Structures are given as structure tokens and as C-alpha cells.
Amino acid sequence: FMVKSVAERHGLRATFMPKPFAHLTGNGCHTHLSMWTAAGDNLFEGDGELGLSPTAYAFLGGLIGHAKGLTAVVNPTVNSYKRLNAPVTVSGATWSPNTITYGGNNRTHMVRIPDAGRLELRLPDGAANPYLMPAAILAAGLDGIETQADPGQRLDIDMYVEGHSVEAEQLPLNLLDAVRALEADEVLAGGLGAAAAAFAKFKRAEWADYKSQLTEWERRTTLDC
Amino acid sequence: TDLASIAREKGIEFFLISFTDLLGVQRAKLVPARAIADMAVNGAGFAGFAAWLDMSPADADILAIPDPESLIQLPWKPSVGWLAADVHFEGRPFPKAPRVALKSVLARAAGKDMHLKHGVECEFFLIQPDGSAISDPADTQAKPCYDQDALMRRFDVIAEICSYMVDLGWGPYQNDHEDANGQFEMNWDYADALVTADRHAFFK
Numbered sequence: 290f291m292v293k294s295v296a297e298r299h300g301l302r303a304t305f306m307p308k309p310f311a312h313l314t315g316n317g318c319h320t321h322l323s324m325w326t327a328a329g330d331n332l333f334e335g336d337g338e339l340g341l342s343p344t345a346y347a348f349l350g351g352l353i354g355h356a357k358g359l360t361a362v363v364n365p366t367v368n369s370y371k372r373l374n375a376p377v378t379v380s381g382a383t384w385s386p387n388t389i390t391y392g393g394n395n396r397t398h399m400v401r402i403p404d405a406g407r408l409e410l411r412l413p414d415g416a417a418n419p420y421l422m423p424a425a426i427l428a429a430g431l432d433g434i435e436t437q438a439d440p441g442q443r444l445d446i447d448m449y450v451e452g453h454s455v456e457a458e459q460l461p462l463n464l465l466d467a468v469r470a471l472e473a474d475e476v477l478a479g480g481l482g483a484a485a486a487a488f489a490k491f492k493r494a495e496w497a498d499y500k501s502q503l504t505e506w507e508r509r510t511t512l513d514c
Numbered sequence: 515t516d517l518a519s520i521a522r523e524k525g526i527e528f529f530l531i532s533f534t535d536l537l538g539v540q541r542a543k544l545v546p547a548r549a550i551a552d553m554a555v556n557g558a559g560f561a562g563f564a565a566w567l568d569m570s571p572a573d574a575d576i577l578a579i580p581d582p583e584s585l586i587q588l589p590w591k592p593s594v595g596w597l598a599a600d601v602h603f604e605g606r607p608f609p610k611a612p613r614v615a616l617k618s619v620l621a622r623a624a625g626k627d628m629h630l631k632h633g634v635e636c637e638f639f640l641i642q643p644d645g646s647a648i649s650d651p652a653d654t655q656a657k658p659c660y661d662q663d664a665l666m667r668r669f670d671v672i673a674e675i676c677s678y679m680v681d682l683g684w685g686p687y688q689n690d691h692e693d694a695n696g697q698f699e700m701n702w703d704y705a706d707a708l709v710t711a712d713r714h715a716f717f718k
């Protein structure tokens with residue numbers, strides 16, 4: 290609200306749209322995450338790989354496990370899916386996640402470990418709801434901690450270059466598929482309560498509206514069929 | 515051959531006595547039939563430096579001696595006869611002139627009983643007269659090669675030229691739209707290298 294308001298006062302306009310230009314990097318909203326006790330200790334701080342604790346990695350396990358449904362919430366628009374799995378931009382990289390994977394200090398994954406004691410979830414975009422996003426992430430993380438979820442193996446590769454080199458699960462490719470995953474995800478749907486079903490209904494309505502819009506690409510490439 | 519008689523028989527009123535310079539530019543004099551007998555023997559005079567031949571303004575005239583066997587009545591304007599010519603300078607064939615240079619190479623090969631024959635694939639685009647765009651705004655698809663639609667959209671131009679090649683005896687056998695939008699190709703039988711070279715020059 291502040292950015293949009295001040296931009297206007299300067300005769301400019303601000304947009305948090307996930308992918309406002311087809312050939313340029315999109316708007317992310319990465320969240321750096323840590324879990325603390327009331328006494329002021331960071332539970333993610335640890336002696337495991339990269340300065341992380343088993344609690345941190347179980348939380349990551351929740352993120353990985355629930356990634357499909359989580360995508361619906363933190364990538365909540367049709368347009369979100371043009372930021373994810375995007376073709377290479379003029380600057381040489383999209384910098385957004387393509388796959389359900391994590392690396393170290395490595396910006397080509399769904400999750401990056403930027404430094405000891407925290408996780409960076411790089412999945413969300415500028416459309417992500419400021420409340421549903423932490424809520425959805427937390428629900429997924431808590432369940433990871435409760436089930437001692439295994440996040441799998443860290444990938445120290447450039448996933449844009451060497452995604453083919455490894456077997457990795459792709460993120461949902463469009464809003465409708467992400468929403469279906471949300472609805473089928475009990476932990477997530479139950480963690481968000483009635484907000485999840487309400488959200489899903491709205492997003493389905495948006496999809497039905499979008500999927501009927503004729504595009505210029507279609508006209509150009511189909512008129513002469 | 516007797517060019518004056520042919521002129522009278524076939525109703526040719528003018529001849530283009532034509533030569534190709536180093537840069538490929540067709541240079542010609544348009545001469546009325548009444549003057550062809552003289553020109554065919556002595557050649558048409560030009561200031562060589564004014565064409566791409568690498569001469570001097572101070573040099574004597576080159577003389578373009580037409581090859582009567584190359585005669586072509588312009589099929590779109592049959593009152594005009596086109597002739598390919600060899601540039602002569604100081605009483606000898608001029609070695610800087612493309613056609614003369616080819617004839618020399620050919621003569622060496624021929625002295626060894628080896629005769630080059632070739633065919634040419636002279637791809638071209640059809641574009642707007644101002645050169646801004648291709649002639650056909652509906653020719654847009656990513657793989658346009660051999661496109662039936664775009665080919666037939668220019669049927670009149672292509673068919674006309676092909677039929678001229680039929681009448682001239684070049685043995686044309688196919689035409690199509692090529693791989694770039696706006697691009698075309700018209701093929702005809704290979705021949706002795708000099709024949710093909712002359713036809714190449716006329717074709718363009």
C-alpha cells in the first residue's frame with residue numbers, strides 16, 4: 290500500500306504482478322524463515338549441513354512434501370505460472386523455481402539455504418497473500434517437523450542448466466493443477482481451515498474466466514489452419 | 515549469324531548489346547536494327563572506366579562484340595533483342611571482363627577434353643518496390659517453404675516467367691516458394707557453362 294501510494298504521488302505506478310513482461314525476470318516474494326522458542330533461541334540453528342538443525346531439515350521436509358498444494362497459495366494467479374518454469378530472460382536467468390528441490394546458497398531451486406539458521410523459500414511471487422502465505426508455509430513446515438519429513442538430497446547444481454541431469458519433480462504448471470493439489474492436501478487444507486476451500490473456489494472461477502479468453506498468439510498462428 | 519536479317523524476319527526493332535562487369539552489373543547499349551550489322555562486326559563502343567572494369571578515363575574505348583548465338587527476343591517485349599557480348603580492348607579480348615575470363619578457363623579445360631556443364635539455382639525474394647518489406651503481407655508462417663497458398667498468390671508473375679523459359683528452350687521443370695517468407699525459386703536444365711552463364715545473366 291505504501292509503495293503504490295508513494296509511486297502515485299510521484300506520477301508513477303507500482304506493480305507486484307508476478308510476470309508483467311514475457312522476456313524479463315518476474316516479481317518474486319521470497320520468504321526467509323526461522324523457528325524460535327519463547328526464550329529466544331533459533332531452532333533452525335544447528336550442527337548439521339550448512340549450519341542447520343534436524344528441526345530445520347524436517348521443516349524443509351514439510352515444504353518439499355507439501356510443495357504442490359503450497360504452490361496454489363503462494364503462486365495464486367494464472368499469471369504466477371508464467372514466472373515459474375519460464376523460458377530464459379534477456380538477463381540470462383529467470384531466478385525463479387522450476388522444480389521441487391533445494392540447494393545450498395543457490396538461487397536456482399525452490400528452496401535456498403542462504404546462511405546458517407534459516408531457509409529461503411523462493412517459490413512465492415508478488416501476488417502472494419501476506420497472511421495466507423506464512424500460514425500455508427507454517428502449516429506445511431509444522432507437519433514436516435511432526436512427521437520428521439525427509440527433504441531429500443541437496444542439489445548443488447544450476448537447475449536451469451542441469452535440470453535434465455537429475456530426476457526432479459516439476460512444480461505444478463498452471464493454476465488449476467496447483468489448486469487441485471491444494472484441495473487434495475489434507476494438512477494444508479486443514480491448516481488453513483475454511484480459507485482454503487474459499488480460496489480454491491475463487492481461483493477456479495478466475496481460471497474458467499481466463500481459459501476462455503482469445504489470445505493474439507492463437508489468432509496469428511491458427512487463422513490460416 | 516546474320517543479325518540484320520533476323521531483325522527483319524522476327525520484327526526486332528532494337529538490340530541490347532550487353533556485357534557484365536566485374537560487379538555483376540549489366541551494361542548495355544540499345545541500338546536500332548539499322549545499325550546492328552556494323553555493331554556485330556566492330557562492336558559497340560564504351561568508356562570502360564565508367565563500368566566496373568578497373569580501367570582509366572584516359573584509355574581507348576572498349577568494344578563490346580556481341581555473340582549472335584546468345585540472341586534473345588525479350589519475351590515480354592519481342593521488338594527488342596538481347597545479346598551477350600565479349601568486351602574487347604586494343605584489338606584483343608579484354609581479360610578483366612568476366613565473360614572473357616570464363617571463356618579462357620573453359621578453353622583450357624576444353625584443350626584437355628573436359629567440358630564444364632552446370633545449372634544454377636537463382637533464389638530470389640519478391641519485395642515491395644521501396645524494399646521495405648516482402649511483396650506479400652499474408653506470407654507470415656514460421657515454416658513457409660513450398661507453401662502452396664503463397665506460391666499461387668504470385669502465380670501470375672511466376673507462371674509468366676516460367677512460360678518464357680519454356681518458349682526460350684531452357685527446359686524449366688519446377689517453381690516454388692522457398693524457405694524464407696517472400697522467397698521463390700525457378701529451375702531450368704543445366705547446359706554448357708557458357709550457355710548457363712549467359713542464361714544466368716539474362717534470367718536475373
Ligand SMILES: Nc1ncnc2c1ncn2[C@@H]1O[C@H](COP(=O)(O)OP(=O)(O)NP(=O)(O)O)[C@@H](O)[C@H]1O
Nearest residue numbers: 631632633634635688692699700701702703704705
Ligand atoms: N549432370 C549435371 N551437371 C550439372 N548440373 C546438373 C546436372 N544434372 C542436373 N543438373 C542441374 O542441377 C539443378 C538442380 O537444382 P534443383 O532442382 O533445385 O535441386 P536441389 O539443388 O537438390 N534443390 P535445393 O533444395 O533448392 O538445393 C538443375 O539446374 C539441374 O538441371
Ligand SMILES: C[S@](=N)(=O)CC[C@H](N)C(=O)O
Nearest residue numbers: 314315316317384385396
Ligand atoms: C535471484 S534475484 N536476483 O533475487 C531475482 C528473483 C526473481 N525476481 C524471482 O522471480 O524470484
Ligand SMILES: [Mg+2]
Nearest residue numbers: 319320409411
Ligand atoms: Mg531472496
Ligand SMILES: [Mg+2]
Nearest residue numbers: 635636699701
Ligand atoms: Mg533448388
Ligand SMILES: [Mg+2]
Nearest residue numbers: 635637692699
Ligand atoms: Mg533452394
